[PDB]
Amino acid sequence: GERPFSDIITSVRYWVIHSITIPALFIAGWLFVSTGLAYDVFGTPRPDSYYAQEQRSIPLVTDRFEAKQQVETFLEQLK
Amino acid sequence: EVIAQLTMIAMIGIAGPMIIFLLAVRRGNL
Amino acid sequence: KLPEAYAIFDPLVDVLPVIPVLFLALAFVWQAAVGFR
Amino acid sequence: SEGGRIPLWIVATVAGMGVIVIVGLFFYGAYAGLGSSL
Amino acid sequence: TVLQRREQLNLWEQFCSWVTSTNNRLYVGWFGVLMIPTLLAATICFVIAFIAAPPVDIDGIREPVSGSLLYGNNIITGAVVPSSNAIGLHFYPIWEAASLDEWLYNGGPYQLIIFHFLIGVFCYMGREWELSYRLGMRPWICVAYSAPVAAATAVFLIYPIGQGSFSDGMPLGISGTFNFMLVFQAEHNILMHPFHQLGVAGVFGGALFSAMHGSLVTSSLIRETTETESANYGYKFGQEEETYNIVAAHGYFGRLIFQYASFNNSRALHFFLAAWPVIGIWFTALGISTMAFNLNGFNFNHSVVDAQGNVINTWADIINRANLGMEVMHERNAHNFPLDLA
Amino acid sequence: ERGWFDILDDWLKRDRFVFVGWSGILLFPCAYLALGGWLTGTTFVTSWYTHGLASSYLEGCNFLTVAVSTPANSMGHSLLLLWGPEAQGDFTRWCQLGGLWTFIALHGAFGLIGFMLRQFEIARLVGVRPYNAIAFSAPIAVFVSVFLIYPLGQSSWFFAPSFGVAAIFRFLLFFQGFHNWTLNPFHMMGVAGVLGGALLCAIHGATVENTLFQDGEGASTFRAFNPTQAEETYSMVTANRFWSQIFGIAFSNKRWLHFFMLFVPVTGLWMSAIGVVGLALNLRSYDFISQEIRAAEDPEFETFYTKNLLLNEGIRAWMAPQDQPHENFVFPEEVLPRGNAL
Amino acid sequence: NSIFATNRDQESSGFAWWAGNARLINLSGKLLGAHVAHAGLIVFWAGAMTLFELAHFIPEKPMYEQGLILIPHIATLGWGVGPGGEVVDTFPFFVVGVVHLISSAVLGFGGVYHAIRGPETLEEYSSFFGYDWKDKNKMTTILGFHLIVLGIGALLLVAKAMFFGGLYDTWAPGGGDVRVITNPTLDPRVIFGYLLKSPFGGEGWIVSVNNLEDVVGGHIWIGLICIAGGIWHILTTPFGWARRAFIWSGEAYLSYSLGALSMMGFIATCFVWFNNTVYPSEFYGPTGPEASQAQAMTFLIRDQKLGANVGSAQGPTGLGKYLMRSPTGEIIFGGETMRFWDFRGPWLEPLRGPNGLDLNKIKNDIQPWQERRAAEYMTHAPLGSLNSVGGVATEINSVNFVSPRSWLATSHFVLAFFFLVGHLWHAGRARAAAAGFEKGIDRESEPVLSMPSLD
Amino acid sequence: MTILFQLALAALVILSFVMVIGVPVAYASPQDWDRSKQLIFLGSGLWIALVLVVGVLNFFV
Ligand code: CLA
Ligand code: CLA
Ligand code: CLA
Ligand code: CLA
Ligand code: CLA
Ligand SMILES: CC1=C(/C=C/C(C)=C/C=C/C(C)=C/C=C/C=C(C)/C=C/C=C(C)/C=C/C2=C(C)CCCC2(C)C)C(C)(C)CCC1
Ligand SMILES: CC1=C(/C=C/C(C)=C/C=C/C(C)=C/C=C/C=C(C)/C=C/C=C(C)/C=C/C2=C(C)CCCC2(C)C)C(C)(C)CCC1
Ligand SMILES: CC1=C(/C=C/C(C)=C/C=C/C(C)=C/C=C/C=C(C)/C=C/C=C(C)/C=C/C2=C(C)CCCC2(C)C)C(C)(C)CCC1
Ligand SMILES: CC1=C(/C=C/C(C)=C/C=C/C(C)=C/C=C/C=C(C)/C=C/C=C(C)/C=C/C2=C(C)CCCC2(C)C)C(C)(C)CCC1
Ligand SMILES: [Ca+2]
Ligand SMILES: [Cl-]
Ligand SMILES: [Cl-]
Ligand SMILES: [Mg+2]
């Protein structure tokens, strides 16, 4: 009962709407990375944050219930 | 020159569909 | 390198080898324009 | 809101070219910056 | 001499009529004229060798590998072992050996079997064309079978040619097959090669689509039987009417996903069932046949590097550690120099 | 009717572009969250703290090397709920601890339940027998045995497959080196069902397409089919004679044919799941005792079976220090198994 | 007027869009356009790819470190190179590229003209250029014209080799160099002897050709054969036995040529993989066998310099670590490279005597240029990844290298394979169409229903 | 003799791009084929001439 997709995406109204929303979504994703926010939301190391300058060991979690605090310590050991 | 290479492939890439479009508008022998 | 007189055309020379691929893609643009009849 | 005013063959061509550009950018990224081995 | 040529000529024509007859229980045909003796020779040699052949010096280092049942193998470990690396790609028929004992030590049976086998299956493919022509069918079943033929040809002929030795062809055995696969991964990273990935999509997808098509037709069989009968008796061989409701089947599948993801055209559907696994197997056969010339899977070893220059490992680097383990252990007495270059 | 339950039932079962149903209340959120979790993790989330691995586009991985990786071995089999005692409601820490892995595994499991319920629900509404749902029990058996039962038998979720292309390749090679999984007869039956299913898919599609009746004048033959037609679109009688003469046997019953296309890949996947359940307990088909007794006593006895164990020993020694970082393996270079030169 | 008003649709032609070029089978004018335009694409690529290669070319790196396949073809003809394959002048590469690129505009012009503007069928316009696929004499006439053209092409190579500067000869005494061929091999016992050589190891069929005299003389024979055969087919019509043996249709002829090109593609794969005479290793890199042999040579040299007696050194298996015997007794390199003892190359042959590798020459006569070459070839072995990471599959990223031999062998195996599939496809279809059942079984006259049951 | 060469080659590139689009459009266009035909002749002749000019001028830069 709904309108065919081929009708929708060949109408100017569809493209008037989505000529705004599609670039807006794309640019928001770009800025999510380029501002560095993605690193902090997900906890992903930046290129200079995998190791400290002297230690060359992986910060592997070894404690189940204080794992949260254990990641906190590894992160305070950088810079 | 990445800007030059991109502009070249843009005009070359547009040329093909431009031929089809011009003929569609002119109701040509497509 | 190309002879230095032609050097300004380097970015165009970089792109030319791909043009044959565009001919195959153009066949589909054309066929879409006639509705794959 | 009427369908057909933008021909479907143009939509398909422009959309496909957009796909090619974005995938092409990802392949460029395989050779530069992160993941380039350099 | 005179009309005798016509008594010979009609006799030849009687033979041609028998060879090409649509009424033989098994079709012979001109391809069958080559196929039948070569498959029989390969089968007979394989069975005798699998049971009774003595150990074979596959890697040319006087280190014979036992493949046969009587020499300590079971069904899983047994194989007919590839011919010696000292032979390389040289043609080694029985009559090039000083004795059968020498021929057996050097892996002669392997060459006899694979060469007759490959002639046999190429002619089996031609024979599938031939009978379809005699029966008034369309011709392309042989094209589907060209996919397994291409794959067999890749592992028994193309890969040995590229690497310079039938000692690197796939062994004729179950554990020998796994050996070939493991060494192949160490030397070509085939898992990271897109043609093998297409192969996997081909066989995972073929199995998926087989189950899908089977379940959808079975789901919509028209009631022709009682509950104490197998529904299979509801179809009679050669009946004109279709035996299931394809409108019902499409109505199910179109709602399972969405309407336009479902085939309503049985011919389109069955073409898709043919093309998907066949194309996937073509590509994986081409994977083996091009890694035969050492164009190998993607190599992302150490591709990710941090700001200082430390490698940050990815799962590709863990794959590399497994490949190294197989590389350094395989053919442990055969390499004298630091690079394995074939 | 009247009554909110019946009114809701009406709306859920409306014929619309995307069927919803009661099953959709489970299916759509769980499938969306499983797929969305995988896309989120492979795009943005590391595996540095669980594996010492980069695993996202953000870090420089590509489509083949990204993954959502399993939690660290120290988490055991923790559900790793966002609000659980490990992450304690901290979303960032939850990602760093591997919570997206259990998120995807568990929403995926319940999504697969929802999908099979969808197959049942739609089959019941349309009036077809639910063979498609029955066939889907095989993917479910595979998912449950591999992603849930296997790690549950092992030390932790760490040894489940990680959700990624290269991560899965690593899982394959781990199973070779540690479980000798290629030697396992349950895996072999799985292989037979997958390859046999792909064979059936190809051969059936090709056979239909090359025994078509001429039902139109076009050289492209797809248009000469009508979904409502009563007649078979291809000749079962000609197909049967072709395969009888080529191969010796042929289908004669279309219903048996399509049931068999379900039976083969469905049964194969079920058998492979049984083998993985054994591997959850390290209950491997690792060795043949008679082979090991002979080889230990006779240093000239060699088979493809003993050759592959040496490859496995290489895999374990070369891959374990980086693949099992929680073990803190340090293998001095002198203890690594290596053949000559390599 | 209407979407379906032309003959360029399924309704008029019987062929769907995805088989649209089959609509051209009996439209000789447009089909001529398609063919000429396609030839323009081939020539276009040759010209444009050469200029791309030249623009990217650093003359002091080896060609094979730079992803080049076309400049090696030009250099093999003796253009642009001197002793050892060093590039002395890039202008010949430039000329080949420009002239192909310019020529492709002419071919494209004619192709586009015949495809959409010129007469759609040629028979009403000209009895000479018009044709019917079923006219067997007209078919052998056009075949004959093209045979003559091909024979001339083979004689152009001969003319280059003998009168216009020669060819690059990796075997030239004193070191590889351009050399004018003055004594091409004309003895048919030699020329056609190649055609009867086994394709197996140590023989290699025609892939074993190892000197430019045989190459040039072979092209003299092929040139005369093709010109004679072309004249023959212009002046004759197919014999009765041929008429009864073949299918006579456009699609059948296409299928014969597909089978032929597939075979040639497989032959080319083996040529570039094994042959280092018409594919000089100076330009294409070492062959697989060559680089494996070069490693053994490299460590023989190193260990002998350290004091090893390489003739008496027993390896772990009991075979010589450096030197052993082939199955017929010749002294060969040891290790896994025992499989490659049929290899022959100009850097190695000075060490070979009547019985194989000569221990005295090995001890006393290995020159630094041989050590250099073996090291170079060992470290440019044709192994590498799809993303062009040079080395074995376990190599770390560092070296950007895939040998031209691997690129050329793999591409032409893939192409030759699908052309064999295409041969089967079109040959089977041509048979079915000539017999009248390519569109399916006649329901009212199904052959199997008139046959006795099998049992 | 001068580096005017860079212009003739630029003209050749421009003229080529103009022909690449114009010739197929003209060949398939209903109207104005009389005017198109002479233009295609002139463009083709100028194109050939520019090829020769660039080819000769090549040897002065
Ligand atoms: C039907 C859809 C559905 C299903 C089956 C699941 C299932 C799951 N989710 Mg997912 N989720 C969903 C939709 C769904 N989710 C949606 C729409 C979102 C976006 C909001 C999420 C966001 C989400 C997150 C962020 C997480 C999960 C997690 C989980 C897992 C643990 C859930 C749990 O313990 O709940 C327990 C709750 C119940 C079983 C509800 C029972 C309700 C009772 C019967 C009613 C009576 C309760 C009573 C009134 C309460 C009184 C409390 C008072 C005393 C204080 C489980 C696999 C966790 C996970 O995957 O960790 C790895 C996790 O971290 N889900
Ligand atoms: C000289 C070589 C040659 C020639 C002249 C022909 C000519 C013909 N073919 Mg045959 N064919 C060939 C080789 C050739 N073929 C080979 C090597 C194969 C095996 C793959 C086939 C398999 C084949 C089939 C199965 C069929 C034909 C058909 C036909 C007819 C219609 C063709 C058409 O309109 O396609 C239109 C072209 C396309 C739809 C494009 C296809 C693109 C391919 C599949 C992918 C290319 C990927 C590219 C190389 C790399 C990636 C690029 C990127 C942009 C994706 C026409 C007579 C049809 C027929 O039988 O008519 C009687 C038919 O059904 N051909
Ligand atoms: C090498 C590739 C190739 C070539 C040379 C051709 C050639 C041809 N095709 Mg085939 N085709 C191909 C690939 C190719 N095709 C592929 C991949 C498909 C699948 C998509 C098809 C599917 C197909 C169908 C369904 C049909 C054809 C038809 C034709 C013929 C008529 C074209 C026409 O009237 O269009 C009209 C198009 C236009 C007017 C647009 C302009 C097109 C021009 C040629 C572009 C020129 C661009 C170029 C840059 C110009 C340079 C000029 C410069 C040198 C001065 C023509 C001989 C038709 C036929 O058989 O007719 C009897 C037909 O019905 N083709
Ligand atoms: C195999 C390719 C081929 C074939 C068989 C044809 C055939 C034909 N053409 Mg076409 N054409 C072609 C390619 C071809 N052309 C090319 C490349 C172009 C661009 C220049 C054209 C542009 C073209 C136009 C504009 C016209 C034709 C016309 C014709 C018809 C009349 C020909 C005639 O009487 O000339 C007589 C022959 C001569 C005067 C002698 C020709 C000698 C040539 C120029 C040199 C040959 C040297 C050597 C063999 C070339 C090798 C090139 C190779 C390396 C690529 C005839 C059907 C006419 C037509 O269709 O009218 C209805 C017409 O008006 N052709
Ligand atoms: C493109 C090249 C080409 C093509 C397509 C043709 C096509 C044809 N030729 Mg012509 N011919 C050519 C070049 C060509 N010829 C040349 C260059 C010459 C000069 C030598 C000739 C001299 C010639 C003569 C004298 C005759 C023909 C004849 C014919 C017709 C029958 C051919 C046939 O049955 O072969 C099939 C081949 C056989 C039936 C012989 C057996 C082949 C064996 C079984 C297989 C060998 C396979 C093996 C792998 C080959 C490679 C290795 C091998 C060399 C060891 C057919 C129209 C006949 C005709 O009717 O003329 C009017 C004929 O009598 N041709
Ligand atoms: C040499 C040279 C030149 C030349 C050039 C040329 C020759 C060009 C051509 C060009 C071309 C030739 C182009 C084309 C293009 C094409 C395209 C761009 C396409 C695309 C497509 C697509 C995108 C598609 C899509 C689709 C469709 C349509 C339908 C189906 C679906 C899909 C999606 C697939 C010049 C002048 C520069 C100058 C100097 C040098
Ligand atoms: C997890 C989580 C969650 C959720 C989330 C989500 C739901 C998400 C989603 C997401 C998404 C949903 C995303 C998406 C993405 C996408 C993408 C990224 C795409 C890409 C693509 C491409 C790249 C393409 C490609 C291709 C193909 C595929 C084929 C064809 C060709 C090409 C190449 C084009 C929540 C909050 C609940 C909670 C917490 C946790
Ligand atoms: C028919 C048809 C088709 C096809 C077509 C074709 C295939 C065409 C071709 C065409 C062609 C094949 C074209 C070509 C052109 C070329 C040109 C136009 C060139 C030019 C050149 C130049 C201009 C150069 C320049 C230079 C110099 C001189 C020096 C160095 C630098 C440079 C490079 C700048 C299709 C598929 C679409 C479909 C429809 C139908
Ligand atoms: C240049 C050169 C040379 C020479 C070469 C030559 C001299 C070649 C020749 C070649 C030849 C001389 C070839 C031939 C070929 C032939 C063929 C390829 C055949 C085919 C056949 C067929 C295909 C048939 C078929 C059939 C049958 C079998 C049965 C009946 C039916 C029919 C007819 C279908 C050399 C090496 C010294 C060196 C380098 C350079
Ligand atoms: Ca029409
Ligand atoms: Cl091994
Ligand atoms: Cl070695
Ligand atoms: Mg990058």
Side-chain angles (χ1 to χ4, degrees), chain E residues 54-55 71 92 94 97-109:
Chain E
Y71 284 75
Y92 190 63
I94 296 182
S99 65
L100 286 174
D101 283 329
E102 173 207 304
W103 183 74
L104 293 166
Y105 183 97
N106 286 273

PDB file of all heavy atoms in Angstrom, chain E residues 54-55 71 92 94 97-109:
ATOM      1  N   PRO E  54      54.631 -49.048  -1.894  1.00  0.00           N
ATOM      2  CA  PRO E  54      55.638 -48.805  -0.846  1.00  0.00           C
ATOM      3  C   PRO E  54      55.880 -47.315  -0.669  1.00  0.00           C
ATOM      4  O   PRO E  54      55.363 -46.498  -1.451  1.00  0.00           O
ATOM      5  CB  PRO E  54      56.884 -49.522  -1.405  1.00  0.00           C
ATOM      6  CG  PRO E  54      56.743 -49.369  -2.884  1.00  0.00           C
ATOM      7  CD  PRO E  54      55.246 -49.428  -3.176  1.00  0.00           C
ATOM      8  N   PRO E  55      56.676 -46.912   0.328  1.00  0.00           N
ATOM      9  CA  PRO E  55      56.843 -45.472   0.592  1.00  0.00           C
ATOM     10  C   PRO E  55      57.517 -44.737  -0.565  1.00  0.00           C
ATOM     11  O   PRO E  55      58.321 -45.300  -1.302  1.00  0.00           O
ATOM     12  CB  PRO E  55      57.713 -45.443   1.855  1.00  0.00           C
ATOM     13  CG  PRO E  55      57.329 -46.748   2.577  1.00  0.00           C
ATOM     14  CD  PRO E  55      57.215 -47.739   1.434  1.00  0.00           C
ATOM     15  N   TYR E  71      51.214 -50.606   4.258  1.00  0.00           N
ATOM     16  CA  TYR E  71      52.426 -50.062   4.861  1.00  0.00           C
ATOM     17  C   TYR E  71      52.127 -49.144   6.040  1.00  0.00           C
ATOM     18  O   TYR E  71      52.881 -48.198   6.293  1.00  0.00           O
ATOM     19  CB  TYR E  71      53.253 -49.344   3.799  1.00  0.00           C
ATOM     20  CG  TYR E  71      53.984 -50.296   2.878  1.00  0.00           C
ATOM     21  CD1 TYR E  71      53.299 -50.992   1.885  1.00  0.00           C
ATOM     22  CD2 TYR E  71      55.351 -50.493   3.000  1.00  0.00           C
ATOM     23  CE1 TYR E  71      53.948 -51.858   1.054  1.00  0.00           C
ATOM     24  CE2 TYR E  71      56.026 -51.367   2.149  1.00  0.00           C
ATOM     25  CZ  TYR E  71      55.319 -52.039   1.185  1.00  0.00           C
ATOM     26  OH  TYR E  71      55.961 -52.914   0.341  1.00  0.00           O
ATOM     27  N   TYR E  92      57.553 -38.751 -16.116  1.00  0.00           N
ATOM     28  CA  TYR E  92      58.102 -39.974 -15.519  1.00  0.00           C
ATOM     29  C   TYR E  92      57.126 -41.140 -15.703  1.00  0.00           C
ATOM     30  O   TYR E  92      56.502 -41.598 -14.741  1.00  0.00           O
ATOM     31  CB  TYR E  92      58.417 -39.740 -14.035  1.00  0.00           C
ATOM     32  CG  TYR E  92      59.204 -40.846 -13.342  1.00  0.00           C
ATOM     33  CD1 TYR E  92      60.499 -41.172 -13.750  1.00  0.00           C
ATOM     34  CD2 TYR E  92      58.658 -41.542 -12.256  1.00  0.00           C
ATOM     35  CE1 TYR E  92      61.222 -42.183 -13.101  1.00  0.00           C
ATOM     36  CE2 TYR E  92      59.380 -42.549 -11.599  1.00  0.00           C
ATOM     37  CZ  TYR E  92      60.657 -42.856 -12.023  1.00  0.00           C
ATOM     38  OH  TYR E  92      61.356 -43.847 -11.377  1.00  0.00           O
ATOM     39  N   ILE E  94      56.222 -45.224 -16.636  1.00  0.00           N
ATOM     40  CA  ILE E  94      56.840 -46.467 -16.166  1.00  0.00           C
ATOM     41  C   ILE E  94      58.111 -46.765 -16.948  1.00  0.00           C
ATOM     42  O   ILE E  94      59.139 -47.144 -16.370  1.00  0.00           O
ATOM     43  CB  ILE E  94      55.841 -47.640 -16.254  1.00  0.00           C
ATOM     44  CG1 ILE E  94      54.661 -47.403 -15.303  1.00  0.00           C
ATOM     45  CG2 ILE E  94      56.518 -48.957 -15.906  1.00  0.00           C
ATOM     46  CD1 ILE E  94      53.609 -48.533 -15.274  1.00  0.00           C
ATOM     47  N   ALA E  97      61.664 -45.555 -15.987  1.00  0.00           N
ATOM     48  CA  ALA E  97      62.304 -46.129 -14.811  1.00  0.00           C
ATOM     49  C   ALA E  97      63.102 -47.373 -15.189  1.00  0.00           C
ATOM     50  O   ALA E  97      62.762 -48.088 -16.136  1.00  0.00           O
ATOM     51  CB  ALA E  97      61.245 -46.488 -13.762  1.00  0.00           C
ATOM     52  N   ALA E  98      64.171 -47.644 -14.432  1.00  0.00           N
ATOM     53  CA  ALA E  98      64.906 -48.882 -14.679  1.00  0.00           C
ATOM     54  C   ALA E  98      64.129 -50.103 -14.209  1.00  0.00           C
ATOM     55  O   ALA E  98      64.404 -51.216 -14.665  1.00  0.00           O
ATOM     56  CB  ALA E  98      66.282 -48.842 -13.998  1.00  0.00           C
ATOM     57  N   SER E  99      63.158 -49.920 -13.319  1.00  0.00           N
ATOM     58  CA  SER E  99      62.401 -51.026 -12.759  1.00  0.00           C
ATOM     59  C   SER E  99      61.140 -50.457 -12.132  1.00  0.00           C
ATOM     60  O   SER E  99      61.070 -49.264 -11.816  1.00  0.00           O
ATOM     61  CB  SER E  99      63.229 -51.798 -11.710  1.00  0.00           C
ATOM     62  OG  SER E  99      63.519 -50.973 -10.579  1.00  0.00           O
ATOM     63  N   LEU E 100      60.146 -51.330 -11.948  1.00  0.00           N
ATOM     64  CA  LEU E 100      58.974 -50.958 -11.164  1.00  0.00           C
ATOM     65  C   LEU E 100      59.367 -50.562  -9.746  1.00  0.00           C
ATOM     66  O   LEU E 100      58.736 -49.681  -9.144  1.00  0.00           O
ATOM     67  CB  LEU E 100      57.959 -52.108 -11.137  1.00  0.00           C
ATOM     68  CG  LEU E 100      57.193 -52.314 -12.454  1.00  0.00           C
ATOM     69  CD1 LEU E 100      56.312 -53.552 -12.384  1.00  0.00           C
ATOM     70  CD2 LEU E 100      56.356 -51.090 -12.775  1.00  0.00           C
ATOM     71  N   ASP E 101      60.378 -51.228  -9.177  1.00  0.00           N
ATOM     72  CA  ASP E 101      60.812 -50.852  -7.833  1.00  0.00           C
ATOM     73  C   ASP E 101      61.283 -49.406  -7.794  1.00  0.00           C
ATOM     74  O   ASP E 101      60.964 -48.672  -6.857  1.00  0.00           O
ATOM     75  CB  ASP E 101      61.919 -51.781  -7.341  1.00  0.00           C
ATOM     76  CG  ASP E 101      61.388 -53.131  -6.889  1.00  0.00           C
ATOM     77  OD1 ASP E 101      60.247 -53.188  -6.397  1.00  0.00           O
ATOM     78  OD2 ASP E 101      62.112 -54.127  -7.019  1.00  0.00           O
ATOM     79  N   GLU E 102      62.063 -48.986  -8.789  1.00  0.00           N
ATOM     80  CA  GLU E 102      62.476 -47.585  -8.870  1.00  0.00           C
ATOM     81  C   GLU E 102      61.268 -46.676  -9.081  1.00  0.00           C
ATOM     82  O   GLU E 102      61.108 -45.664  -8.393  1.00  0.00           O
ATOM     83  CB  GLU E 102      63.488 -47.391 -10.005  1.00  0.00           C
ATOM     84  CG  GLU E 102      63.823 -45.905 -10.228  1.00  0.00           C
ATOM     85  CD  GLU E 102      64.261 -45.586 -11.658  1.00  0.00           C
ATOM     86  OE1 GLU E 102      65.221 -46.214 -12.148  1.00  0.00           O
ATOM     87  OE2 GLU E 102      63.630 -44.707 -12.292  1.00  0.00           O
ATOM     88  N   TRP E 103      60.398 -47.034 -10.034  1.00  0.00           N
ATOM     89  CA  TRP E 103      59.200 -46.245 -10.318  1.00  0.00           C
ATOM     90  C   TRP E 103      58.376 -46.014  -9.051  1.00  0.00           C
ATOM     91  O   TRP E 103      57.912 -44.898  -8.792  1.00  0.00           O
ATOM     92  CB  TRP E 103      58.387 -46.969 -11.398  1.00  0.00           C
ATOM     93  CG  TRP E 103      57.133 -46.302 -11.895  1.00  0.00           C
ATOM     94  CD1 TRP E 103      57.043 -45.226 -12.721  1.00  0.00           C
ATOM     95  CD2 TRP E 103      55.781 -46.724 -11.632  1.00  0.00           C
ATOM     96  NE1 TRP E 103      55.714 -44.941 -12.990  1.00  0.00           N
ATOM     97  CE2 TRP E 103      54.922 -45.850 -12.338  1.00  0.00           C
ATOM     98  CE3 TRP E 103      55.219 -47.767 -10.886  1.00  0.00           C
ATOM     99  CZ2 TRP E 103      53.522 -45.969 -12.293  1.00  0.00           C
ATOM    100  CZ3 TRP E 103      53.818 -47.888 -10.842  1.00  0.00           C
ATOM    101  CH2 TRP E 103      52.993 -46.988 -11.539  1.00  0.00           C
ATOM    102  N   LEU E 104      58.230 -47.049  -8.226  1.00  0.00           N
ATOM    103  CA  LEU E 104      57.460 -46.916  -6.992  1.00  0.00           C
ATOM    104  C   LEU E 104      58.170 -46.017  -5.979  1.00  0.00           C
ATOM    105  O   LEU E 104      57.527 -45.184  -5.334  1.00  0.00           O
ATOM    106  CB  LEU E 104      57.196 -48.303  -6.407  1.00  0.00           C
ATOM    107  CG  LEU E 104      56.261 -49.225  -7.226  1.00  0.00           C
ATOM    108  CD1 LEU E 104      56.378 -50.669  -6.696  1.00  0.00           C
ATOM    109  CD2 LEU E 104      54.778 -48.733  -7.197  1.00  0.00           C
ATOM    110  N   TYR E 105      59.491 -46.173  -5.817  1.00  0.00           N
ATOM    111  CA  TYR E 105      60.222 -45.324  -4.869  1.00  0.00           C
ATOM    112  C   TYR E 105      60.058 -43.847  -5.212  1.00  0.00           C
ATOM    113  O   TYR E 105      59.969 -42.993  -4.318  1.00  0.00           O
ATOM    114  CB  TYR E 105      61.709 -45.708  -4.863  1.00  0.00           C
ATOM    115  CG  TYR E 105      62.570 -44.947  -3.864  1.00  0.00           C
ATOM    116  CD1 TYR E 105      62.867 -45.488  -2.616  1.00  0.00           C
ATOM    117  CD2 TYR E 105      63.112 -43.699  -4.190  1.00  0.00           C
ATOM    118  CE1 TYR E 105      63.685 -44.800  -1.715  1.00  0.00           C
ATOM    119  CE2 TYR E 105      63.915 -43.012  -3.309  1.00  0.00           C
ATOM    120  CZ  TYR E 105      64.192 -43.557  -2.072  1.00  0.00           C
ATOM    121  OH  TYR E 105      64.982 -42.853  -1.199  1.00  0.00           O
ATOM    122  N   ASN E 106      59.999 -43.528  -6.499  1.00  0.00           N
ATOM    123  CA  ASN E 106      60.020 -42.144  -6.951  1.00  0.00           C
ATOM    124  C   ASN E 106      58.636 -41.545  -7.160  1.00  0.00           C
ATOM    125  O   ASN E 106      58.543 -40.393  -7.601  1.00  0.00           O
ATOM    126  CB  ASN E 106      60.849 -42.049  -8.235  1.00  0.00           C
ATOM    127  CG  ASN E 106      62.329 -42.167  -7.957  1.00  0.00           C
ATOM    128  OD1 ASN E 106      62.992 -41.167  -7.670  1.00  0.00           O
ATOM    129  ND2 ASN E 106      62.851 -43.394  -7.994  1.00  0.00           N
ATOM    130  N   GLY E 107      57.569 -42.284  -6.850  1.00  0.00           N
ATOM    131  CA  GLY E 107      56.231 -41.738  -6.968  1.00  0.00           C
ATOM    132  C   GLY E 107      55.665 -41.748  -8.373  1.00  0.00           C
ATOM    133  O   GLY E 107      54.845 -40.887  -8.711  1.00  0.00           O
ATOM    134  N   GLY E 108      56.102 -42.693  -9.217  1.00  0.00           N
ATOM    135  CA  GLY E 108      55.489 -42.889 -10.514  1.00  0.00           C
ATOM    136  C   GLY E 108      53.981 -43.043 -10.533  1.00  0.00           C
ATOM    137  O   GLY E 108      53.325 -42.501 -11.434  1.00  0.00           O
ATOM    138  N   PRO E 109      53.382 -43.805  -9.604  1.00  0.00           N
ATOM    139  CA  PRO E 109      51.911 -43.954  -9.649  1.00  0.00           C
ATOM    140  C   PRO E 109      51.167 -42.633  -9.640  1.00  0.00           C
ATOM    141  O   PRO E 109      50.172 -42.492 -10.356  1.00  0.00           O
ATOM    142  CB  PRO E 109      51.599 -44.794  -8.400  1.00  0.00           C
ATOM    143  CG  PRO E 109      52.800 -45.646  -8.219  1.00  0.00           C
ATOM    144  CD  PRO E 109      54.003 -44.783  -8.680  1.00  0.00           C
TER     145      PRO E 109
END
